[PDB]
């Protein structure tokens with residue numbers, strides 16, 4: 693007996709991303725690196741969870757045995773503990789580690805070793821630390837390889853983390869269609885996550901129709917959720933350009949109302965740039981209007 697996915701999702705509520713930080717090529721190379729006070733402010737702001745993207749590529753050896761720099765693991769643990777110590781449901785993953793998609797067969801072992809070491813190093817963390825296998829799994833990889841990856845990375849995790857909730861891609865959506873996974877691993881500690889995906893990238897968001905599209909997507913995902921008995925998590929919503937200020941505020945308010953109503957847990961995307969940012973890391977102030985739209 694441990695905490696179950698549905699209980700975890702209800703607990704996660706609305707949260708935030710620590711974007712363009714640990715998933716940049718090197719911490720700091722993009723947005724300001726992680727500072728402990730970030731978490732004090734997130735807490736004071738109402739966030740109930742913090743997703744922490746991480747790109748392991750440049751901190752892991754490029755050749756066998758694919759060891760992760762101890763120094764980097766220490767760094768991620770420091771940031772995780774700041775989050776966990778403040779009561780946040782904390783999520784860590786693999787983000788922008790595209791090398792794995794560029795050659796699945798050739799790089800899957802390095803990906804396993806990476807996950808092997810992560811699971812090991814955090815095996816004793818609170819139940820509130822969740823393992824998200826890979827940020828946006830859909831794309832330049834086959835549906836079979838995606839399924840193979842989840843099964844094997846999940847199996848690695850389970851050896852040292854028997855009951856820790858793992859997050860895997862449940863599907864994605866766009867203005868034309870929604871895709872959901874039918875092939876779900878047989879595990880009692882999984883949460884499904886969906887992101888906006890468009891296989892044909894080759895307007896501006898915020899309209900009426902756009903909202904009708906999302907409510908549609910959300911209802912289908914919800915049906916998926918009830919049918920497969922698996923909670924839902926929108927790990928990075930509101931990653932779009934809007935026609936104007938008033939439209940942006942409206943979208944955050946809408947999206948979060950619709951998700952929380954259907955019992956979905958979610959994290960807003962915040963790249964810390966002042967440009968899809970809600971929290972200013974230099975002034976330690978939030979875009980109050982948006983924060984109120986989320987809660």
Ligand SMILES: O[C@@H]1[C@@H](O)[C@H](O[C@@H]2CO[C@@H](O)[C@H](O)[C@H]2O)OC[C@H]1O
Pocket residue numbers: 712827887928931961963
């Ligand atoms: O500044 C850019 C970031 O905003 C960008 O972050 C992507 C935004 O969409 C989300 O779905 C992705 O997860 C997130 O990585 O990355 C590139 C950077 O230059």
